[PDB]
Design a protein around this motif. Structure first.
Motif, PDB file in Angstrom:
ATOM      1  N   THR B 115      20.802  66.365  -1.367  1.00 53.93           N
ATOM      2  CA  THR B 115      22.117  65.962  -1.835  1.00 53.93           C
ATOM      3  C   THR B 115      22.191  64.444  -2.128  1.00 53.93           C
ATOM      4  O   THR B 115      22.853  64.010  -3.057  1.00 53.93           O
ATOM      5  CB  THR B 115      23.184  66.270  -0.735  1.00 53.93           C
ATOM      6  OG1 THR B 115      23.317  67.703  -0.583  1.00 53.93           O
ATOM      7  CG2 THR B 115      24.573  65.714  -1.088  1.00 53.93           C
ATOM      8  N   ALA B 116      21.578  63.625  -1.277  1.00 49.11           N
ATOM      9  CA  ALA B 116      21.613  62.165  -1.424  1.00 49.11           C
ATOM     10  C   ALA B 116      21.076  61.780  -2.801  1.00 49.11           C
ATOM     11  O   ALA B 116      21.650  60.915  -3.466  1.00 49.11           O
ATOM     12  CB  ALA B 116      20.839  61.472  -0.315  1.00 49.11           C
ATOM     13  N   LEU B 117      19.984  62.436  -3.217  1.00 49.50           N
ATOM     14  CA  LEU B 117      19.341  62.132  -4.493  1.00 49.50           C
ATOM     15  C   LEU B 117      20.020  62.786  -5.667  1.00 49.50           C
ATOM     16  O   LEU B 117      20.145  62.200  -6.746  1.00 49.50           O
ATOM     17  CB  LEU B 117      17.886  62.535  -4.466  1.00 49.50           C
ATOM     18  CG  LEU B 117      17.105  61.968  -3.289  1.00 49.50           C
ATOM     19  CD1 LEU B 117      15.655  62.454  -3.252  1.00 49.50           C
ATOM     20  CD2 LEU B 117      17.129  60.496  -3.244  1.00 49.50           C
ATOM     21  N   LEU B 118      20.483  64.012  -5.477  1.00 47.15           N
ATOM     22  CA  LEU B 118      21.199  64.709  -6.538  1.00 47.15           C
ATOM     23  C   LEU B 118      22.472  63.933  -6.911  1.00 47.15           C
ATOM     24  O   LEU B 118      22.772  63.720  -8.080  1.00 47.15           O
ATOM     25  CB  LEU B 118      21.562  66.149  -6.109  1.00 47.15           C
ATOM     26  CG  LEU B 118      20.377  67.012  -5.728  1.00 47.15           C
ATOM     27  CD1 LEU B 118      20.883  68.265  -5.031  1.00 47.15           C
ATOM     28  CD2 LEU B 118      19.487  67.382  -6.894  1.00 47.15           C
ATOM     29  N   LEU B 119      23.247  63.527  -5.908  1.00 48.10           N
ATOM     30  CA  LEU B 119      24.464  62.758  -6.152  1.00 48.10           C
ATOM     31  C   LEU B 119      24.132  61.334  -6.618  1.00 48.10           C
ATOM     32  O   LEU B 119      24.811  60.828  -7.512  1.00 48.10           O
ATOM     33  CB  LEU B 119      25.360  62.737  -4.904  1.00 48.10           C
ATOM     34  CG  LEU B 119      25.976  64.084  -4.599  1.00 48.10           C
ATOM     35  CD1 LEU B 119      26.834  64.024  -3.412  1.00 48.10           C
ATOM     36  CD2 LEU B 119      26.818  64.614  -5.777  1.00 48.10           C
ATOM     37  N   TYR B 122      23.100  61.454 -10.307  1.00 52.13           N
ATOM     38  CA  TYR B 122      24.297  61.690 -11.120  1.00 52.13           C
ATOM     39  C   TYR B 122      25.189  60.466 -11.162  1.00 52.13           C
ATOM     40  O   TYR B 122      25.714  60.081 -12.204  1.00 52.13           O
ATOM     41  CB  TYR B 122      25.088  62.916 -10.609  1.00 52.13           C
ATOM     42  CG  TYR B 122      26.417  63.085 -11.272  1.00 52.13           C
ATOM     43  CD1 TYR B 122      26.508  63.481 -12.579  1.00 52.13           C
ATOM     44  CD2 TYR B 122      27.561  62.797 -10.585  1.00 52.13           C
ATOM     45  CE1 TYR B 122      27.728  63.568 -13.188  1.00 52.13           C
ATOM     46  CE2 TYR B 122      28.783  62.883 -11.170  1.00 52.13           C
ATOM     47  CZ  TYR B 122      28.851  63.264 -12.473  1.00 52.13           C
ATOM     48  OH  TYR B 122      30.069  63.388 -13.102  1.00 52.13           O
ATOM     49  N   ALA B 123      25.412  59.837 -10.014  1.00 52.35           N
ATOM     50  CA  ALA B 123      26.231  58.630  -9.971  1.00 52.35           C
ATOM     51  C   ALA B 123      25.756  57.531 -10.893  1.00 52.35           C
ATOM     52  O   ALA B 123      26.547  56.883 -11.578  1.00 52.35           O
ATOM     53  CB  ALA B 123      26.363  58.139  -8.544  1.00 52.35           C
ATOM     54  N   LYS B 124      24.452  57.315 -10.907  1.00 49.92           N
ATOM     55  CA  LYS B 124      23.870  56.201 -11.628  1.00 49.92           C
ATOM     56  C   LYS B 124      23.621  56.508 -13.091  1.00 49.92           C
ATOM     57  O   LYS B 124      23.608  55.581 -13.906  1.00 49.92           O
ATOM     58  CB  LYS B 124      22.531  55.816 -11.018  1.00 49.92           C
ATOM     59  CG  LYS B 124      22.621  55.181  -9.619  1.00 49.92           C
ATOM     60  CD  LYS B 124      23.202  53.759  -9.611  1.00 49.92           C
ATOM     61  CE  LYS B 124      22.197  52.676  -9.754  1.00 49.92           C
ATOM     62  NZ  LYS B 124      22.952  51.346  -9.802  1.00 49.92           N
ATOM     63  N   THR B 125      23.420  57.769 -13.457  1.00 50.19           N
ATOM     64  CA  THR B 125      23.043  58.112 -14.825  1.00 50.19           C
ATOM     65  C   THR B 125      24.034  58.986 -15.583  1.00 50.19           C
ATOM     66  O   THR B 125      23.956  59.081 -16.830  1.00 50.19           O
ATOM     67  CB  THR B 125      21.711  58.808 -14.875  1.00 50.19           C
ATOM     68  OG1 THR B 125      21.830  60.152 -14.377  1.00 50.19           O
ATOM     69  CG2 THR B 125      20.654  58.091 -14.109  1.00 50.19           C
ATOM     70  N   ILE B 214      26.374  63.711   2.697  1.00 50.47           N
ATOM     71  CA  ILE B 214      27.312  62.857   1.998  1.00 50.47           C
ATOM     72  C   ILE B 214      27.757  61.669   2.896  1.00 50.47           C
ATOM     73  O   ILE B 214      27.946  60.543   2.413  1.00 50.47           O
ATOM     74  CB  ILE B 214      28.494  63.685   1.500  1.00 50.47           C
ATOM     75  CG1 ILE B 214      28.032  64.478   0.287  1.00 50.47           C
ATOM     76  CG2 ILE B 214      29.693  62.826   1.168  1.00 50.47           C
ATOM     77  CD1 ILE B 214      28.979  65.557  -0.227  1.00 50.47           C
ATOM     78  N   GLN B 215      27.897  61.888   4.202  1.00 52.27           N
ATOM     79  CA  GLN B 215      28.281  60.810   5.103  1.00 52.27           C
ATOM     80  C   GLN B 215      27.186  59.729   5.248  1.00 52.27           C
ATOM     81  O   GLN B 215      27.423  58.654   5.807  1.00 52.27           O
ATOM     82  CB  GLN B 215      28.677  61.364   6.451  1.00 52.27           C
ATOM     83  CG  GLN B 215      29.986  62.125   6.356  1.00 52.27           C
ATOM     84  CD  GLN B 215      30.316  62.864   7.592  1.00 52.27           C
ATOM     85  OE1 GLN B 215      30.804  62.301   8.578  1.00 52.27           O
ATOM     86  NE2 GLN B 215      30.012  64.131   7.588  1.00 52.27           N
ATOM     87  N   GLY B 216      25.990  59.967   4.716  1.00 49.37           N
ATOM     88  CA  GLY B 216      24.951  58.978   4.683  1.00 49.37           C
ATOM     89  C   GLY B 216      24.935  58.179   3.381  1.00 49.37           C
ATOM     90  O   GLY B 216      24.160  57.213   3.281  1.00 49.37           O
ATOM     91  N   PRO B 221      27.027  52.771  -4.166  1.00 50.17           N
ATOM     92  CA  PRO B 221      26.946  53.046  -5.608  1.00 50.17           C
ATOM     93  C   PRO B 221      26.341  54.400  -5.952  1.00 50.17           C
ATOM     94  O   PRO B 221      26.372  54.798  -7.117  1.00 50.17           O
ATOM     95  CB  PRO B 221      26.049  51.923  -6.130  1.00 50.17           C
ATOM     96  CG  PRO B 221      26.150  50.816  -5.089  1.00 50.17           C
ATOM     97  CD  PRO B 221      26.326  51.546  -3.771  1.00 50.17           C
ATOM     98  N   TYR B 222      25.778  55.074  -4.962  1.00 50.13           N
ATOM     99  CA  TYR B 222      25.086  56.330  -5.137  1.00 50.13           C
ATOM    100  C   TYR B 222      25.965  57.543  -4.882  1.00 50.13           C
ATOM    101  O   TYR B 222      25.533  58.683  -5.087  1.00 50.13           O
ATOM    102  CB  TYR B 222      23.839  56.377  -4.238  1.00 50.13           C
ATOM    103  CG  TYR B 222      23.002  55.138  -4.470  1.00 50.13           C
ATOM    104  CD1 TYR B 222      22.269  54.983  -5.639  1.00 50.13           C
ATOM    105  CD2 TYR B 222      23.010  54.070  -3.562  1.00 50.13           C
ATOM    106  CE1 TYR B 222      21.552  53.824  -5.888  1.00 50.13           C
ATOM    107  CE2 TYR B 222      22.310  52.924  -3.815  1.00 50.13           C
ATOM    108  CZ  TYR B 222      21.572  52.789  -4.986  1.00 50.13           C
ATOM    109  OH  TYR B 222      20.895  51.590  -5.214  1.00 50.13           O
ATOM    110  N   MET B 223      27.168  57.307  -4.389  1.00 46.42           N
ATOM    111  CA  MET B 223      28.152  58.355  -4.247  1.00 46.42           C
ATOM    112  C   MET B 223      29.098  58.324  -5.454  1.00 46.42           C
ATOM    113  O   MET B 223      29.825  57.345  -5.632  1.00 46.42           O
ATOM    114  CB  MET B 223      28.984  58.198  -2.973  1.00 46.42           C
ATOM    115  CG  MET B 223      29.988  59.288  -2.750  1.00 46.42           C
ATOM    116  SD  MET B 223      29.238  60.904  -2.471  1.00 46.42           S
ATOM    117  CE  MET B 223      30.588  62.005  -2.901  1.00 46.42           C
TER     118      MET B 223
END
Lengths: 304, 333
Positions: B115-119, B122-125, B214-216, B221-223
């Motif tokens: 989830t950390a990477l998927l979000l 998406y957040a950045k791109t 998600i709490q991590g 900027p990644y959320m």
């Protein structure tokens, strides 16, 4: 600022999360007896002795319990019986206006971080990392001595906060101290109840009874939030019952990896908060830390 | 919203280990999972940390970021899939080549800690990423309903779909459990139902994933910022009531429930109710304090099997009353 604690004052107790007064009744009686012998009154909150499995009661019941203490003008100090996990649930329901109108000493640790930081965020009044009734007063004399030194006695400034601390990264830093239990901070981050971390702040973080994987996640949480671009120094508490996963690496070593050689003064194995005995310390006030010489001083008043 | 190319038969799937070292600790399950996809005609490109061991993780933060970036930058790779999650994917976030991803969009898929990477991506791109299978837990030998998971994977990633696209409820599902005496897991298979906890409908951008993870990343900027009208998708697994109450209250105090139009809650594999006999959605209802947001629970995009593959960052219509979820716009080209 809250009024100094005085002899004979009334300490209000509440259970914002785990139902320890039901599950550890003998330690609870021992802790009350200790403070009563010292002359304090104990006002037991409405959930004392109640049980709802993992918690003392519903969200609304717990908020009612704490609010009754906040609104009582005869209570000088509000102390959790213990933490747990669920103090953050209360945050939308606390009577911050009643607290701000008559500030008192709010003290606890671990999960109580959510309330300590939330009250400070909402009111600007310093709150205190320090004992919870059942774990701390349930060795006790040292914890009590520190409790009194911070809350009751007058202190010339600078106030030296004393306790085998580790100079991980040498240097000095001066700024407002902010933080608490890092796992608990991840349950309030981003909300109106988390005070904004500002350039120059001194970060105080602790955790206990976690593993290397969990604490790496928490340290990286801080890193990706830019916290280490803002803070002037870091105070890392001892980590009791740490599971290093076989790595042989201490918590501070994991933090060092996350920091990637950013030069931030770092003092580790500080004696807060899941230790016995423990330091009582205000949050939200100016501090000077010296990581090289292993000292921490409070620079401004935290009570009247 | 730029889009990844569809998966094609014979494509190269790159695998990486952003957290737990499963390819070292469970080499047999790993090889069986790999074999399952090789037999489907896919090529499996093993990332640089395959077979490596660093205790609770596959390697250092920098090594893990290098592993993933090599896949992102490889023009032969069409799909990037985690071997497994864990806890430590968020460490990689400062170091990922988001520019290379943005300019060569590909399918990024996984679940749980991923989830950390998927979000983050998406957040950045702004490119949709996918909550869906991870190699070893999803296609490993003794996992149940594997062919159904695989069918869902192709349905979302390979097959062309007419819109609106209905995400079909699986007929059956399984959890797994292991006792103290036996060495292999028991699996309980059962008829499925989605739960209309709070009736209603909602249309908006779906955002979410594993709530604990998600709490991590929250506040960074990644959320991705949650916006008015979004549909919140949340799942957790193997937690207790205290933990999930904290996570739900975390959302509440952040104003998330003042923003979202609807909530999709995944099944909670092996939930520990702490003796309360309360379901996760009931704890959520307490936190919501009668704010009546349409809420569809026991959605199959979580740790239970089979697993749906769901795009994140695209418009969806959820009908909690009639228990349907439709994707309303394209998520691949």
């Amino acid at each position: 600022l809250p009024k100094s604690l005085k002899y004979g004052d009334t300490i209000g107790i509440y259970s914002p999360s785990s139902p320890v007064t039901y599950t550890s009744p003998k330690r609870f009686e021992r802790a009350k007896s200790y403070l009563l012998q010292k002359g304090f009154h104990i006002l037991e909150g409405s959930l004392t002795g109640r049980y709802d499995y993992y918690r003392s009661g519903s969200i609304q019941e717990r908020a009612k319990e704490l609010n009754a203490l906040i609104r009582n003008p005869n209570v000088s100090c509000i102390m959790s019986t213990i933490g747990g996990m669920n103090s953050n649930s209360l945050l939308p329901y606390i009577d911050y206006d009643a607290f701000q109108n008559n500030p008192k000493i709010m003290i606890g640790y671990s999960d109580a971080t959510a309330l300590l930081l939330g009250i400070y965020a909402k009111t600007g009044i310093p709150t205190f990392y320090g004992p919870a009734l059942v774990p701390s007063f349930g060795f006790v004399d040292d914890t009590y001595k520190y409790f009194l030194e911070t809350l009751l006695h007058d202190q010339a400034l600078p106030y030296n906060i004393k306790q085998n601390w580790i100079s991980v990264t040498n240097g000095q830093a001066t700024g407002r101290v902010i933080g608490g239990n890092l796992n608990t901070i991840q349950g309030i981050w981003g909300s109106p109840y988390m005070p904004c971390i500002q350039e120059g702040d001194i970060l105080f973080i602790e955790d206990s009874s976690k593993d290397a994987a969990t604490i790496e996640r928490s340290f990286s949480f801080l890193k990706i939030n830019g916290v280490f671009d803002k803070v002037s120094g870091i105070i890392l508490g001892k980590h009791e019952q740490f599971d290093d996963c076989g790595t042989n690496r201490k918590p501070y070593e994991i933090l060092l990896e996350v920091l990637q050689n950013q030069r931030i003064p770092l003092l580790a194995d500080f004696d807060c908060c899941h230790t016995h005995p423990m330091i009582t310390m205000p949050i939200g006030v100016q501090v000077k830390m010296d990581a090289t010489n292993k000292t921490i001083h409070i620079l401004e008043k935290w009570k009247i």
